[PDB]
Amino acid sequence: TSWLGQLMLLLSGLTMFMAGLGANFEFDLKKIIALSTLSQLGLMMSILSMGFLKLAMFHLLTHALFKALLFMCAGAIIHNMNNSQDIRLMGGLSIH
């Protein structure tokens, strides 16, 4: 119940919108995943700006799990594509 919470809620939702549009237009793998990190930060900071500590903590633990999993996936894929983080060069990795 503060102007700090109102401003933080607006800026957190705005960085959600920023991160969604930026990762939809980004052509780098690990930069897309860092923009996904930004989108989840916007989700947690806006739900704590509502005022829900347990919801923010639950999504924090969940995001830490699946986002370390995504970055480990991206590192293995980059290490086999020989340091090329561009998403245009990569293709069809479901078979390989």
The nearest distance, CB 14 to other proteins, in angstroms, is 6
Residues 26-55 close enough to bind other proteins by CB under 8 A: 26-28, 54
The nearest distance, CB 54 to other proteins, in angstroms, is 6
In one-letter notation, the amino acid at residue 10 is L
Tell whether residue 73 is a contact of other proteins (CB under 8 A): no
Which CB sits closer to other proteins, 37 or 85? 85
The DSSP secondary-structure symbol of 83 reads S
CA angle centred on 38, ends 35 and 44, rounded to 5°: 150
Burial 20-46 (b: 16+ CB within 10 A, else e): eebbeebeebeebbbbbbbbbbbbbbb
Binding residue for other proteins, selected from 57, 68, 72, 76, defined by CB under 8 A: 57
Tell whether residue 6 is a contact of other proteins (CB under 8 A): yes
Tell whether residue 83 is a contact of other proteins (CB under 8 A): yes
